[PDB]
Amino acid sequence: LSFESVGGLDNYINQLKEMVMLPLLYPEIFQRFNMQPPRGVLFHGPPGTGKTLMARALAAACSSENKKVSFYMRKGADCLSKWVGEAERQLRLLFEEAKSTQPSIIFFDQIDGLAPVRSSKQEQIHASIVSTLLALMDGMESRGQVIIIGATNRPDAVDPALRRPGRFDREFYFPLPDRDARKKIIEIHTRNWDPPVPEWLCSMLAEKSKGYGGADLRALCTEAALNSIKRTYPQLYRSTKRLQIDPKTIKVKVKDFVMSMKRMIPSSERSSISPSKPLSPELKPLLNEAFQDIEKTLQKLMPVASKLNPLEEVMYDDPKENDFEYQQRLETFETLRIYKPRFLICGRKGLGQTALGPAILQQYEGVHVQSFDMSTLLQDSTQSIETSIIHLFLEVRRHTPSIIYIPDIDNWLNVLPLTAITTFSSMLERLDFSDQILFLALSSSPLSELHPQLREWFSSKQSVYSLQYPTRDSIIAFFQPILELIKASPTELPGGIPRKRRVLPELPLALTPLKQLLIDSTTGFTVDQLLHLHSFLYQIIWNTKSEWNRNSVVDECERAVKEFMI
Amino acid sequence: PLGVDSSLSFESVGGLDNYINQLKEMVMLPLLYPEIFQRFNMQPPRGVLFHGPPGTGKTLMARALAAACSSENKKVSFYMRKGADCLSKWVGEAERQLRLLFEEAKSTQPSIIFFDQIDGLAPVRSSKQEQIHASIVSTLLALMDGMESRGQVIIIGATNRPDAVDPALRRPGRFDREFYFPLPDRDARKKIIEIHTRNWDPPVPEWLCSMLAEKSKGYGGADLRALCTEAALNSIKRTYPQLYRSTKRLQIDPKTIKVKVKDFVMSMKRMIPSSERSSISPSKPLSPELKPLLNEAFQDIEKTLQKLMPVASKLNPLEEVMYDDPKENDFEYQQRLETFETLRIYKPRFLICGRKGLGQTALGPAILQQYEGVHVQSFDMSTLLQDSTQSIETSIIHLFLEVRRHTPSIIYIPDIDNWLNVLPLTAITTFSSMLERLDFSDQILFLALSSSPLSELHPQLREWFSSKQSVYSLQYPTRDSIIAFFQPILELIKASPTELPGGIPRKRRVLPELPLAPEDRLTPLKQLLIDSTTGFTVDQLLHLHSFLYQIIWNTKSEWNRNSVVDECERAVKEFMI
Ligand SMILES: Nc1ncnc2c1ncn2[C@@H]1O[C@H](COP(=O)(O)OP(=O)(O)OP(=O)(O)O)[C@@H](O)[C@H]1O
Ligand SMILES: Nc1ncnc2c1ncn2[C@@H]1O[C@H](COP(=O)(O)OP(=O)(O)OP(=O)(O)O)[C@@H](O)[C@H]1O
């Protein structure tokens, strides 16, 4: 498994192949420069993302070389016992034995349980284990060629004196795979699968996922395998002994995947709500004209161009790299292009925004979002609201680029007390004018009457977008799938045929006028009520899903519309 | 492996020279000259603490002392010791191994003892903890200085937090002396970047040191070696990208790995210092695009702050005595000297105000960087309400107990008008109940930059300062300063093709295989930029300074200028409305 069954994390592999693989085959290249090359890593991130996978793949891609790189394991707090001087005696002969087998690695795991923050508010035994392990990582004599690797979820409860250079000195991050890391993950765990899956749905299964992560994508593919067995042999669930069965007659088809997509929740959505979903396809030919102008405007206010791996960036050539100037020109153009970006979707009540906000918020992959709205700002009663505001700002300031997102800003100013509006408005000006954070907001009161604090923010005419209601020569495309359904129904719709019952073997032991009428009857409607007509006459199609005569339903759905204006 | 050389004798230590001389007065010169110590009939003392933030030179000062005495001349002996190894399961042997230790050292009369991470060994004697820890400190309290003299054994301790040890151990006679390594400030980083590059065959030029000293603002001694070993490791990646993507040795000419300049500045973007992993330092220098708008006002505040609290740097005591003493035996010439530079200061306070976006939040955290050797902590909203466990008043108490420690320091509060509208009234009184009960001579400041301008401010501020010399009001930018601000833009509008770094695209590099081993319309625009911008504050000026760079970014490589002016007027024509 020599680094082949790990997808997406290409950049950290080349940074890892200089600590254990490349002082060892080229020792003379480190003796000109008189250096250590360093011996510490630290892994941190959200749960289920490929953390302990790399520490297993690394110790499997070293023993297959006959170079004899021995290593060790830990299981959290495991050098801890009831006797007095026992808890430190293990840590002496752990590092002692590691020296006498000189090329050696040590893997801790969940180091939060072992080394907390030193304070006088706890027992004294947790101070001695921290103070000892801090001391023999670099004493006044060296520790030999010993590489230390740790991992945890919350990288803040470890002691800050244990995060110095010389001890850990290299922090990584596994940020919940974005778009096409999921394309490679879902093709690793479905490798052989003898009628092999084509490319045209592996690019489709990636797009439906928006935050499964590397631990849930294996559970998606292993559930669709279990759904395929139930399709071909239902007799297996109704026995106790073995049966004469034959493999190599089961094929994972498309239906086994999509029925496994519907009944599975991912890992990070079981507690929270995760506000992002794409546009509804029935809603598409009414808002995509207004959608593209917003996506084109946001490129100017925050360019979010991707990151290149360094081995594909140094492979080019460049003639003039000696001067102190022209080095302060590459990142300078990408620095003052941005200056405090902000945006709104203001307009009338319900003609837009509530289905257009989370359409934008699922495009950016690249990022880390938050939500400063209700139901997450006051959903606990232990702290105040002036403390839960500060805790989110401490998170959004790291892991740039980021997005602050508030839906329904108009009621948001009438509910929070006034000593919390000032606290939120204070932290917006402490951070500098050049970092890459955004500020989305969605209002419902139209222009020239909005609240006098939304004018103190956003301070421009570029960062406000009006939302006028739609363009009569586009509504004839909105009802176009309906008129393709009022045309005759020879069970074109799914239904009408009570299909079949499968017999099982034994398996022994071993149309002109209403189209005009739809036009000069609404003519001023908003989309909030345009869904109502689409959700009214759609019931009329369901009740006539099996009749065979079409000159009569079209008089029903003109009777259905003639009282709706009333 | 490869190892490091054990030939370090007081030369690989930069920026610390006061402590080397005091350390040389304990092991080297009671022995070479014993005849001049009974002439005063004295002890000369034996004992040292080492306390400070992590990674500032505590080891590689104790380590260098052993190599400088063992390689000097015969003979000396020394005992290593880890954190806490002198305690085990059975009842009394934690005290047996300690009594074996000092007895063995006494039989080898010139000797020193290294205690490392002493907080695991001797905590504060209290009844809330199990008393085997109170026992082995008590026998160590009596073994250092008891009924019989211990001999010539010197004790050295290292500590990150110098407050958890017992106060009966810091008595003079047992430890006698405390040091403090203060996170190397400005000029110490010039040498501490120079020692670690005793250097490569293209030796590092002097003009970028100090330039890496200026960019560093709180790295320290540990991570500055990590900066140099990162850029050197980046150079191997440049000159041989075929070193990866293989398994065996290939071929190496280890001479074409000369380090260029670009590897340093690329390595500065990826490194984060050890002090800012959790918190955030409130200091950033002036941005070079903004400097001709504020440089006149920056030196004016600097000139006023020199008379309020002088903080001028002082010297090591060996260089002081090289100046000859004049006729001096009476303490009347020198009793002025302590009366002076004590009564020259009187409650130094300061406050910066004006209209919004007219200066401050930029020059605020800029004077906090230009002078060093002082302690900074921020009484901010993100630091008071940060902890949800304890009360809000206790956090104001626990910071005043810290700033009355070591040095000249600074109480720094941004945006004071958003203050007093968030905190309760019972906390505002408490913070005002500590500024008065400290004396009128401690060198502690009260920096506070503020909102909405003079004669409109609620009067709790107007008795805290209450003096004409301790308030400052900015103004709008003048006419003759604005045309200097837009000068690099209009310079960049002409010299198009080979100047912008987006012109000729970079070509591919070939790879060897490496086998195995055994002015026409310009002045219309120039006059247009004035007579349209007469009353702008300094923050919305930065809008148009940003709105013009997007224009040239789309035109990064197009030729035929005198066709790129026609879009800039309709930009600025939109702005006044
Ligand atoms: N790209 C991938 N391909 C196949 N499996 C993966 C991939 N990424 C993650 N996994 C699965 O995730 C599991 C755990 O990995 P990792 O420890 O990084 O997740 P985690 O969320 O950190 O778990 P924990 O937080 O409990 O340590 C592995 O068993 C592995 O099967
Ligand atoms: N002047 C210097 N030149 C080169 N390296 C230095 C210098 N000062 C300190 N260092 C580096 O600091 C490291 C640790 O030294 P020291 O133990 O004094 O720091 P520390 O903060 O006390 O660490 P700890 O608190 O963990 O003992 C050494 O590895 C050394 O490389």
Author numbering:
A (entry chain D): 263 to 772, 1131 to 1186
B (entry chain E): 256 to 773, 1128 to 1186
Q: Would you copy out the relevant sentences from the publication that reported this structure?
A:
ATAD2 (also termed ANCCA) is a histone chaperone that has been implicated in nucleosome density regulation by histone H3–H4 loading or removal. Although histone chaperones responsible for nucleosome assembly and disassembly usually do not contain ATPase domains, ATAD2 is unique because it is the only known AAA+ ATPase histone chaperone. Here, we demonstrate ATP-dependent histone H3–H4 deposition onto DNA by Abo1, the fission yeast ortholog of ATAD2, using an in vitro single-molecule imaging technique, the DNA curtain. We solve the cryo-EM structures of Abo1 in three different nucleotide states (apo, ADP, and ATP), revealing a major reorganization of the AAA+ domains from an open spiral to a closed ring—a structural change that can also be recapitulated in real time by high-speed atomic force microscopy (HS-AFM).
We first solved the cryo-EM structure of Abo1 in an ATP-bound state to 3.5 Å resolution using an ATP-hydrolysis deficient Abo1 Walker B mutant (E372Q). The atomic resolution model revealed two layers of AAA+ domains arranged in a hexameric spiral, with the AAA1 domains forming the top layer and the AAA2 domains the bottom layer. Densities for six bound nucleotides were found at the interface of AAA1 protomers. We assigned five of the nucleotide densities as ATP, but the identity of one nucleotide (in subunit A) could not be determined with certainty although we modeled this nucleotide as ADP based on superposition with the ADP state (see below). No nucleotide density was found at the interface of the AAA2 domains, consistent with the fact that AAA2 has no consensus Walker A or B motifs and is presumably catalytically inactive. First, Abo1 subunits have a molecular clasp where the “knob” of one subunit locks into a “hole” of the neighboring subunit by an electrostatic interaction. However, individual subunits in the ATP state displayed a marked difference where the AAA1 domain and the linker arm progressively shift away from the AAA2 domain as the subunits rise in height along the spiral axis. Unexpectedly, after building an atomic model into the cryo-EM map of the ATP-Abo1, we discovered a lobe of extra density in the central pore that could not be accounted for by any part of Abo1. We modeled this density as a 14-alanine chain, and examination of interactions between the polyalanine chain and Abo1 revealed that the W345 sidechains of Abo1 form a winding tryptophan staircase around the peptide, where the middle subunits (B–E) form direct contacts. In the ATP-state, Abo1 assumes a closely packed spiral that binds the histone H3 N-terminal through its pore loops and the histone body through its bromodomain.
